[PDB]
């Protein structure tokens with residue numbers, strides 16, 4: 325049976341490490357702290373929870389994190405005033421807009437996200453940072469936090485990535501598409517599947533590394549898993565309890581390593597955001 | 611055997627349509643002409659050839675194309691000055707830097723490319739345009755010209771892309787990587803291969819659509835091809851041969867691009883199309 329990749333434990337070690345860096349950066353440049361801002365439009369329940377988890381992580385580490393919550397009646401123009409203000413405020417080192425925006429008005433999300441200064445785009449959602457990642461220019465770009473966290477989970481298996489066949493199910497802007505790029509430039513051979521893929525079960529069965537980011541509860545069946553695969557489940561689904569996008573019971577009988585839900589990718593997403601925030605704080609000093 | 615995808619004939623149809631568009635444009639707004647600039651660093655023979663092919667196509671269409679060639683010893687700072695000048699010249703609608711740079715001094719290609727204004731980046735090489743393409747924002751970006759030409763050749767088959775398994779061999783900034791994205795947002799299931807891919811023959815055999823962009827002459831064997839595959843060969847290797855072993859591949863493919871006269875003419879035609887598109891937007 326598969327060994328469990330314990331994201332809860334792994335993230336803790338990352339956060340302890342970040343806390344020491346933050347404490348150490350204070351006794352290098354005094355009064356200086358990493359500063360994060362999180363902008364929210366509307367009042368989605370899941371966004372409220374995820375933002376709150378991120379605030380807790382930043383607090384424990386020493387990052388000063390501000391949460392701005394705009395109402396559902398907010399217009400695209402009002403959101404842009406905040407993005408411009410956060411770009412200009414040299415005390416803010418990174419910020420992000422929690423997605424999706426929950427507005428009754430029509431707001432161009434792509435236009436909002438792409439007003440974020442790329443040097444503060446710790447969520448890696450601007451076209452500029454996406455374009456660097458998608459073309460293999462990894463040294464000078466923020467990488468989206470869920471793919472970052474999935475790569476770290478993969479590395480914890482000690483199984484090298486180069487030459488393996490990776491399958492990514494899902495191509496969303498925040499997870500699946502950057503996940504493909506990250507695996508590719510770590511020299512996996514990568515297949516991307518989506519809602520138009522035919523014979524999904526056959527495609528999934530080719531993955532030595534499998535990352536599932538569909539938002540469909542337990543859709544990926546254990547039978548589909550290649551024996552010995554490294555299975556990374558990004559799904560967080562509320563069903564009649566929380567389950568992921570992989571049928572966990574069947575899959576753990578065939579994988580060599582598997583992420584549980586909860587306690588797998590989710591805590592790693594948050595840890596990687598704090599790491600990117602510290603990185604933009606350190607970069608700002610230079 | 612395969613039907614041949616005649617890139618010579620298809621590109622001539624595209625260039626004639628563009629010529630008539632430009633003619634009509636000039637009738638509607640007298641004195642206006644689409645303008646392209648090509649910047650080159652060094653004096654590579656292949657670059658000289660491909661640039662010359664581009665200038666001739668622009669001339670046939672009625673696009674005014676200027677070519678600026680800098681010596682092998684130019685500095686990054688001097689290359690940047692020209693890019694700034696091109697960005698600021700409001701009579702220039704698109705421009706590109708022919709790659710690779712041939713310099714004696716270390717010049718940061720990524721910094722040079724990324725100083726191009728995205729609205730004039732007709733080669734689609736800026737990070738801004740790459741990121742738009744890579745995340746499916748296909749209406750607000752220039753797509754690189756060779757992937758655009760490959761997509762048009764695949765569409766000439768009349769077979770829908772959606773649901774097919776496509777294999778891209780190569781991940782370069784100009785061809786392989788944007789090709790993956792174009793096929794992905796046409797709803798293919800896409801596998802990307804590279805020089806660390808193990809069992810390349812088995813990955814190629816999965817491809818209903820196969821695009822080979824490696825620069826390794828005839829390395830992709832015909833026996834690896836899935837029977838009935840659509841086979842797109844971007845290679846130009848020096849006779850001139852492609853990246854696919856053509857004779858064996860043609861036996862098994864449903865459609866296949868010859869080399870030469872396949873992808874090559876389509877690449878140039880797609881550059882002209884993007885140029886005319888930038889000029890049209892600039893009137894608007």
Ligand SMILES: NC(=O)c1ccc[n+]([C@@H]2O[C@H](COP(=O)([O-])OP(=O)(O)OC[C@H]3O[C@@H](n4cnc5c(N)ncnc54)[C@H](OP(=O)(O)O)[C@@H]3O)[C@@H](O)[C@H]2O)c1
Nearest residue numbers: 494495496498499518519520536537538539558559560569
């Ligand atoms: N977004 C969040 O705030 C958040 C928070 C926690 C967890 N998650 C988890 O993170 C992952 C990504 O979520 P997201 O919101 O970024 O995704 P999303 O925008 O909802 O996109 C889902 C992706 O899965 C694909 N897909 C859907 N049904 C499929 C099927 N039956 N077969 C194959 N592919 C299918 C879609 O294909 P198409 O592109 O063709 O539509 C799309 O690429 C999910 O597992 C989700 O549960 C999300």
Ligand SMILES: NC(=O)c1ccc[n+]([C@@H]2O[C@H](COP(=O)([O-])OP(=O)(O)OC[C@H]3O[C@@H](n4cnc5c(N)ncnc54)[C@H](OP(=O)(O)O)[C@@H]3O)[C@@H](O)[C@H]2O)c1
Nearest residue numbers: 780781782784785803804805806822823824825844845846
């Ligand atoms: N560049 C031009 O001006 C030009 C003009 C005419 C024609 N072309 C054609 O355009 C295509 C791309 O050219 P490019 O300049 O963009 O090439 P490039 O930058 O050299 O990229 C070559 C790609 O092929 C991959 N590759 C090399 N050997 C391989 C192997 N044995 N198995 C699998 N993948 C392998 C490389 O993998 P890695 O990423 O691991 O290195 C890389 O992604 C080629 O077909 C070329 O003939 C180019």
Ligand SMILES: Nc1nc(N)c(NC(=O)Nc2ccc(C(=O)N[C@@H](CCC(=O)O)C(=O)O)cc2)c(=O)[nH]1
Nearest residue numbers: 374377420421422423424447586587588590591593
């Ligand atoms: N801009 C932006 N928008 C977004 N919608 C996201 N996604 C985005 O926050 N996801 C997310 C998922 C899981 C958790 C998480 O902490 N999950 C824990 C459970 C947390 C708890 O309840 O304590 C787990 O799965 O184990 C946090 C964030 C993002 O990263 N950036």
Ligand SMILES: Nc1nc(N)c(NC(=O)Nc2ccc(C(=O)N[C@@H](CCC(=O)O)C(=O)O)cc2)c(=O)[nH]1
Nearest residue numbers: 660663706707708709710733870871872874875877
């Ligand atoms: N910036 C930039 N750099 C680059 N290096 C390229 N590639 C870039 O120009 N390729 C290219 C390929 C083929 C031809 C072409 O016309 N090929 C003909 C043969 C050429 C001839 O023999 O005259 C054919 O295959 O049929 C022209 C350009 C590019 O498109 N943009």
